[PDB]
Design an enzyme around this catalytic site. Structure first.
Site, PDB file in Angstrom:
ATOM      1  CG  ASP A 261      64.160  41.770  38.810  1.00  0.00           C
ATOM      2  OD1 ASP A 261      63.660  40.442  38.212  1.00  0.00           O
ATOM      3  OD2 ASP A 261      63.498  42.376  38.423  1.00  0.00           O
TER       4      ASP A 261
ATOM      5  CB  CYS B  13      68.617  30.302  41.785  1.00  0.00           C
ATOM      6  SG  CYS B  13      69.983  29.705  42.646  1.00  0.00           S
ATOM      7  CB  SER B  14      71.706  32.936  38.606  1.00  0.00           C
ATOM      8  OG  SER B  14      71.564  33.157  39.809  1.00  0.00           O
ATOM      9  CB  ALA B  15      75.520  30.266  41.491  1.00  0.00           C
TER      10      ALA B  15
ATOM     11  N   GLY C 281      72.376  30.129  46.598  1.00  0.00           N
ATOM     12  CA  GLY C 281      71.739  30.996  47.296  1.00  0.00           C
ATOM     13  C   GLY C 281      70.317  30.743  47.306  1.00  0.00           C
TER      14      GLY C 281
ATOM     15  CD  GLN D 113      74.276  33.492  46.775  1.00  0.00           C
ATOM     16  OE1 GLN D 113      73.977  33.796  45.773  1.00  0.00           O
ATOM     17  NE2 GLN D 113      76.144  32.549  46.492  1.00  0.00           N
TER      18      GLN D 113
HETATM   19  C1  LIG Z   1      72.736  38.596  45.190  1.00  0.00           C
HETATM   20  N1  LIG Z   1      73.135  37.853  44.329  1.00  0.00           N
HETATM   21  C2  LIG Z   1      74.372  37.670  44.247  1.00  0.00           C
HETATM   22  C3  LIG Z   1      75.321  38.535  43.885  1.00  0.00           C
HETATM   23  C4  LIG Z   1      76.183  38.630  45.774  1.00  0.00           C
HETATM   24  C5  LIG Z   1      77.208  39.762  45.220  1.00  0.00           C
HETATM   25  C6  LIG Z   1      77.306  40.573  44.295  1.00  0.00           C
HETATM   26  C7  LIG Z   1      76.281  40.330  42.784  1.00  0.00           C
HETATM   27  N2  LIG Z   1      76.286  41.745  42.804  1.00  0.00           N
HETATM   28  C8  LIG Z   1      75.824  42.180  41.382  1.00  0.00           C
HETATM   29  O1  LIG Z   1      75.387  42.205  39.723  1.00  0.00           O
HETATM   30  C9  LIG Z   1      74.811  42.712  42.217  1.00  0.00           C
HETATM   31  C10 LIG Z   1      75.315  44.652  41.949  1.00  0.00           C
HETATM   32  C11 LIG Z   1      74.815  45.853  41.429  1.00  0.00           C
HETATM   33  O2  LIG Z   1      74.416  47.216  42.139  1.00  0.00           O
HETATM   34  N3  LIG Z   1      73.652  46.084  40.258  1.00  0.00           N
HETATM   35  C12 LIG Z   1      74.776  46.643  38.492  1.00  0.00           C
HETATM   36  C13 LIG Z   1      74.864  45.979  38.157  1.00  0.00           C
HETATM   37  C14 LIG Z   1      74.821  44.905  37.381  1.00  0.00           C
HETATM   38  C15 LIG Z   1      75.263  43.945  36.838  1.00  0.00           C
HETATM   39  C16 LIG Z   1      75.900  44.177  36.032  1.00  0.00           C
HETATM   40  C17 LIG Z   1      76.504  45.716  36.049  1.00  0.00           C
HETATM   41  C18 LIG Z   1      76.156  45.821  37.475  1.00  0.00           C
HETATM   42  O3  LIG Z   1      77.361  46.381  35.152  1.00  0.00           O
HETATM   43  C19 LIG Z   1      77.710  44.805  34.642  1.00  0.00           C
HETATM   44  O4  LIG Z   1      76.857  43.886  34.844  1.00  0.00           O
HETATM   45  C20 LIG Z   1      75.095  39.572  42.743  1.00  0.00           C
HETATM   46  C21 LIG Z   1      74.601  36.194  43.227  1.00  0.00           C
HETATM   47  I1  LIG Z   1      76.035  35.193  43.082  1.00  0.00           I
HETATM   48  C22 LIG Z   1      73.311  36.028  43.344  1.00  0.00           C
HETATM   49  C23 LIG Z   1      72.579  34.487  43.446  1.00  0.00           C
HETATM   50  C24 LIG Z   1      71.404  33.950  43.363  1.00  0.00           C
HETATM   51  C25 LIG Z   1      71.067  33.161  43.706  1.00  0.00           C
HETATM   52  O5  LIG Z   1      69.695  32.719  44.297  1.00  0.00           O
HETATM   53  O6  LIG Z   1      71.762  32.550  42.690  1.00  0.00           O
HETATM   54  C26 LIG Z   1      70.907  35.546  44.874  1.00  0.00           C
HETATM   55  O7  LIG Z   1      69.411  34.025  45.214  1.00  0.00           O
HETATM   56  C27 LIG Z   1      71.249  35.967  45.170  1.00  0.00           C
HETATM   57  C28 LIG Z   1      72.887  36.690  44.037  1.00  0.00           C
END
Ligand SMILES: Cn1c(-c2cccc(NC(=O)CCC(=O)NCc3ccc4c(c3)OCO4)c2)c(I)c2cc(C(=O)O)c(O)cc21
Length: 264
Positions: A164, A198-200, A203, A245
């Protein structure tokens, strides 16, 4: 990695379609869109729909093609199979769970084992779900209703073990997995582009398409040939923006490629 994140402070290509009002809710992230020149165009849609040609995805061909796109949305599941069918894809690479960290990364668009659903004019028959360690292989029969003579098998490798947070501490799972998908895709003569999402769809998706592109390099030339990760990322990002990303996903591609060479 930063020398490239900057290299995208401005985009050299147009993404005018994704913004059209009608395609507004056909994307999971308003900011992530597909360049008009590579984006997958969808033909033969409900003539009752103004715009039925849009789907957030991009053909990715090394310069074996791929198709990178987002995880399905409740309202995009039919546009998704239309793409699969239209493109003649035979392999599907799910890299996200259906809900990570409590949120929907992808909507279920494949029917339960032995079951069969219909999506618009498309029908899908899960004829057998097998489930190994790092992933589950589902044999699906896709075909357009009203025409069973079009039916074709579409194997969907669903990687399930990806953390995750962060990325795999070891590239072994991703490599055996991709190794499978490679040979599977190779056996099917005349198959379409391998889809990977994947989600978007930029990445983690980009991390796989990329690793796979390089491993294909290492199969054709050997463990001696030159690998230019950074020139490769630019290469795909020119077809779909944002591919890879994070730095961790970046370092993985490196640990991934080396490990593979070790194996050889
Ligand atoms: C790492 N990252 C990101 C990506 C880039 C920048 C920021 C984030 N932000 C987060 O949500 C993490 C924040 C955290 O610490 N949690 C606490 C928390 C979670 C959800 C909540 C909440 C609080 O409050 C309301 O909701 C995600 C993407 I877009 C992305 C996309 C892929 C892909 O394969 O498509 C991948 O493999 C990795 C990816």
């Amino acid at each position: 990695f930063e020398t490239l994140q900057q290299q995208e402070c401005k985009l050299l290509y147009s993404r005018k379609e994704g913004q059209r009002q009608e395609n507004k809710n056909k994307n999971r992230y308003k900011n992530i869109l597909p360049f008009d020149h590579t984006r997958v165009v969808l033909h033969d849609g409900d003539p009752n729909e103004p715009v039925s040609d849009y789907i957030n995805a991009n053909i990715i061909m090394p310069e074996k093609s791929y198709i990178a796109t987002q995880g399905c949305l409740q309202n995009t599941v039919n546009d998704f199979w239309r793409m699969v069918f239209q493109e003649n894809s035979r392999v599907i690479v799910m890299t996200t769970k259906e809900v990570e960290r409590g949120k929907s990364k992808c909507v279920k668009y494949w029917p339960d084992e032995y079951a069969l659903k219909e999506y618009g004019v498309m029908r899908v028959r899960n004829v057998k779900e097998s489930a190994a360690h790092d992933y589950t292989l589902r044999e699906l029969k896709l075909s357009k209703v009203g025409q069973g003579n079009t039916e074709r098998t579409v194997w969907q490798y669903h990687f399930r073990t990806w953390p995750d947070h962060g990325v795999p501490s070891d590239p072994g799972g991703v490599l055996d997995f991709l190794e499978e998908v490679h040979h599977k895709q190779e056996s099917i003569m005349d198959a379409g582009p391998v889809v990977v999402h994947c989600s978007a769809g930029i990445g983690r998706t980009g991390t796989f398409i990329v690793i796979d592109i390089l491993i294909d390099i290492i199969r054709e030339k050997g463990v001696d040939c030159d690998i230019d990760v950074p020139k490769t990322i630019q290469m795909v990002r020119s077809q779909r923006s944002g591919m890879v990303q994070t730095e961790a996903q970046y370092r993985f591609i490196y640990m991934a490629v080396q490990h593979y060479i070790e194996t050889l």
